[PDB]
Paper text:
This study reveals the structure of the V-ATPase:SidK complex, an assembly formed from the interaction of host and pathogen proteins involved in the infection of phagocytic white blood cells by Legionella pneumophila. Removal of the C-terminal residues 415–573 of SidK did not significantly affect V-ATPase inhibition by the SidK mutants, but truncations of the N-terminal region of the protein has been demonstrated to prevent V-ATPase inhibition.
The first crystal form contained one molecule of SidK(16–278) in the asymmetric unit and the final model included amino acids 16–274. The three α-helical bundles contain four, four, and three α-helices, respectively, and are connected by loops in the bundles. However, the N-terminal bundle with its extensions, which from previous analysis was proposed to be the region that interacts with the V-ATPase, does not resemble any other known protein structures. The monomeric SidK predominates in solution, even at high concentrations, and therefore the elongated monomer structure is expected to be the functional state of the protein. Only the N-terminal region of SidK interacts with the V-ATPase and consequently a highly-elongated SidK structure was unexpected.
Numbering used by the authors: 0, 16 to 275
Amino acid sequence: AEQYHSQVVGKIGYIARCMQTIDPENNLKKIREDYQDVLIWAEKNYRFEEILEASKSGKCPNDLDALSRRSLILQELLRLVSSISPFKMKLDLIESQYEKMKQHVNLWKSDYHVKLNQLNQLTDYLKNAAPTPKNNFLRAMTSVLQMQIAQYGITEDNEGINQLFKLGLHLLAMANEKIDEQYHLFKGYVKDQPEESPFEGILPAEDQKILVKTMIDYAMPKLSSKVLQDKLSALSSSDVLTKTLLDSIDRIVKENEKLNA
């Protein structure tokens, strides 16, 4: 009996704490407007017994099932903001993304939810992943994924975002011994995406250098002359992995075929 209204007070506070975690500076006026009937009981110095009585007498929203459904929506919005960190979504997009989540007929079978699930699976795997070429490839693309979700959201049709999910999950499914398949996937991604330097501002400068060295060290054993070896080493001066760099390596690899039958 009194346990139920204690749950109502708890759920009211949980929603407010979720809102405070998302928006501590009170910038999301539209989302807070949707929850003002709940938030008001936590931003005034009501004591527990007062909110408990407010639930017993109906002065606050006291349908526990309805409060939980509203809470899960806000929890999914917080997960979106948390899952893209260290990248940040602008205020108006946070609120428009919330509106899409709120208005969905079944949010928990939507691709918004499934995309968040699979994004978290990538970041979870990367937590304790050894710095192999495969995982460095995956970390680079997962970071681009987070940045594109922060810019475009998680609800609209985006072939770039789906391709990053696809290629990222494929790297995770690849065996550590399928080296040529890992590089073919990664090189293929950089060539097929539209940005000339798709990792600048997204990866740390040292991570970009490691990617450059990974491409050089992969192609170097194939070369059959010092002249072509020197041309490839001349490319290792680049601190950024660009589409141009990859094409310049492929031209050297192509020239090497003239020295082989």
